[PDB]
Design a protein around this nucleic acid. Structure first.
Ligand SMILES: Nc1ncnc2c1ncn2[C@@H]1O[C@H](COP(=O)(O)OP(=O)(O)NP(=O)(O)O)[C@@H](O)[C@H]1O
Ligand SMILES: Nc1ncnc2c1ncn2[C@@H]1O[C@H](COP(=O)(O)OP(=O)(O)NP(=O)(O)O)[C@@H](O)[C@H]1O
Ligand SMILES: [Mg+2]
Ligand SMILES: [Mg+2]
Lengths: 351, 36, 352, 36
DNA sequence: GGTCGGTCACCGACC
DNA sequence: GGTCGGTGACCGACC
């Protein structure tokens, strides 16, 4: 998923905003209540029709808007293709409209879905992830930076799998293969040959949907690739002190501190932020092509001056990537470290 | 890519299976009537 | 609860620490992983037997320690009386030894409780509050600053009211009433009216205290008004009359007004939630003086910009006046130097 | 003072006429409780 | 002061 | 409706 343009009107803290996104790093600066997080939830609401902060859709409408209407237009690219989502959340009429059109090479707009429910299903297909996976990996909201890290092994594996697999394919494959076994049981030399087919599909079903086999192996093989980069990021950031590995039995992410073992929840504020950020920029690297954005809303304030600058240094060395990387901060000490800035105050972009 | 699900799965079987020819055959037929 | 002294060996990230607490404000300041919050969970652990970060006691033992044993001595004053708690967690032997003693004026230690559970039970009787109430009101942990404010209605009232009433007293009181009533009905001219009349007076009094609908409700409401009165005051000073606060349990909890526009706590920004949370905390701290005489706020000024960090710090300084043990924990030097008395921790030991 | 029992004395006096008798019974009970 | 056991009181059940 | 049964909380004693 690669953000290209985002237009906001009267969404939460926002009054009007219009942003082109591009490869590289961008810092979104601004005071409290300026509208930084609103812009983040905006993208979230453009795609999945869910936000972070509120249970109910009509809450997201800027209550000061005089027509009670929030409008969102989001344009993004995936896998060569290019998509446009338009939304109106009308809080007076209590009407929520939403369409997703494809943008073709000849400049017309082929429609793929209208209304919230089918737009979300379409978005979830094009992306190949669900909302939870989105906010737990490469799109980390304010105050929720360490959720993946301290999650139980069950959740972690679901999240990882989903990033690197089509649930749309697997859902059907599992179903199709059910159908071809209850159609062989249905039957009742032929009865030996249909007994021995039921049993070759069943060996296939087992290696593929037992919890419990290849899922456990595949998660291992992904986290192996992911933690290889994290270990290296952690060697740079902590001078060889911290090591990270993943164990299902030991409750999840397991950290070594000068060799000593500690559950990720043992860590402190800064160490957690520091070890969530290098784990997050690792995941994004290993998920390029699948996931092409990396957003953080305010990790870096847990961090002391030494660690903030160190973290900033490594992050800055992502600038090279063909990734839409965006960090959000009120902290000027962190922000000044980067070149491309976007300042937001009072619900508008400034200067 | 390396971390391709079924390319990972094409291999997890070869370690754990001898009858992995007809099995990966079956898997391929099935994915095709999912492609359809 | 007024922390007098605290000594620690090998708990979490601490090696050795011996700390006498004073009145007014101290700032604990030091880098990521210094041991700041470790001291914080040490107090909570010594009193209630529970950390913040681990469900299992043996995990609080510093793994570097050569004996595999953590030791905790906490001494504190409540209601004139003085107590001391000594706890030894041995991670190697899976042993947790705890004991509570009143330190009489003469100075002999009279034992009160000598097990992790008997200590936790006596502590709740003394302090007046359960562990959850402690960590939501006046002892606020890193990353949990706003937990009371976005909390659902039924919890918010269980918590603030627990401060001001006694589960111990009420439980006994209700039972004794239950027996006196049973005896009177068991004991069944003028005497009958006397025996049967006091039966009813008891029952009319029973109805007023223990039908949750009755005084219990009313009490919680009087309590809330008191706390919100103060919270509204602080908010006027901090946000130029922009943000008001109120409580409605049919509206899902604490509700903020933004120039008159209603908004549930969870809808505020990271900065606005921390600024309003602290206000609420300071208020509860004022309203429960004599019952809780400490006020610890670890990691609660991170998502606060420069204008609000300066505003928040100045207000917090205006508590230096009060006879209390007030402690702020930070890694930010900027924020910590707005105050006078600093306690510096590095490498799990006090420095300077 | 915000004391649970002080507030009850005020709450009962408002809506209860037999309150003076009732608060009295309460005091006796509070005493038997404190003793134990 | 901790533990473990005894008894009495109370609600349940079947009489 | 009253009587029989079992289980649950308080208390004193002994470690
Ligand atoms: N069981 C343990 N044994 C030894 N060290 C531990 C243990 N648990 C945590 N630590 C480490 O002890 C150090 C102190 O932790 P902590 O007290 O949370 O730090 P802190 O001063 O509050 N730092 P911060 O919250 O980042 O600003 C950290 O480096 C932890 O990783
Ligand atoms: N429904 C709403 N209508 C109007 N304003 C709202 C609504 N919900 C929240 N706000 C306000 O919109 C402003 C922007 O919020 P937000 O975007 O989260 O700020 P922010 O930039 O992240 N500030 P901070 O977290 O403190 O760094 C805040 O003042 C919110 O209280
Ligand atoms: Mg924000
Ligand atoms: Mg800390």
């Amino acid at each position: 998923m690669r953000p290209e343009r985002l237009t906001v009107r009267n969404f939460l803290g926002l009054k009007n905003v219009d942003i082109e996104f591009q490869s590289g790093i961008t810092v979104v600066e601004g005071p409290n209540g300026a509208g930084k997080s609103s812009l983040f939830e905006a993208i979230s609401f453009a795609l999945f029709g869910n936000g972070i902060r509120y249970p109910n859709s009509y809450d997201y409408v800027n209550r000061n808007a005089v027509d009670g209407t929030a409008r969102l237009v989001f344009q993004f690219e995936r896998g060569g293709k290019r998509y446009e989502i338009i939304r109106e959340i009308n809080a007076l009429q209590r009407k929520h409209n939403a369409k997703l059109s494809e943008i073709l090479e000849n400049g017309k707009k082929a429609a793929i879905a209208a209304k919230p429910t089918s737009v979300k299903q379409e978005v979830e297909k094009i992306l190949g992830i669900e909302h939870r996976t989105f906010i737990r990996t490469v799109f980390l909201p304010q105050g929720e930076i360490d959720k993946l890290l301290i999650s139980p092994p069950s959740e972690i594996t679901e999240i990882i799998s989903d990033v690197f697999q089509s649930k749309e394919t697997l859902e059907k494959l599992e179903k199709l293969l059910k159908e071809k076994m209850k159609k062989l049981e249905n039957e009742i030399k032929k009865l030996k040959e249909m007994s021995d087919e039921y049993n070759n599909l069943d060996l296939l079903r087992k290696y593929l949907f037992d919890k419990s086999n290849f899922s456990r192996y595949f998660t291992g093989r992904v986290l192996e690739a992911v933690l290889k980069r994290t270990k290296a990021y952690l060697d740079i950031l902590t001078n060889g002190r911290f090591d990270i590995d993943f164990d299902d039995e030991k409750g999840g992410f397991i950290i070594k501190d000068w060799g000593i073992e500690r559950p990720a929840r043992g860590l402190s504020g800064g160490e957690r932020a520091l070890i969530s950020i290098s784990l997050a920029m690792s995941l994004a690297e290993v998920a390029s092509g699948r996931l092409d954005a990396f957003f953080i809303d305010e990790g870096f304030s847990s961090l002391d001056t030494e660690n903030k600058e160190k973290i900033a240094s490594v992050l800055k060395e992502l600038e090279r990537l063909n990734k839409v990387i965006v960090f959000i901060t009120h902290d000027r000490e962190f922000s000044e470290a980067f070149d491309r800035k976007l300042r937001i105050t009072g619900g508008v972009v400034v200067n | 890519d390396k971390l391709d699900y079924f390319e990972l799965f094409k291999e997890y079987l070869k370690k754990r299976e001898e009858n992995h020819e007809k099995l990966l055959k079956i898997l391929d037929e099935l994915l095709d009537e999912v492609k359809k």
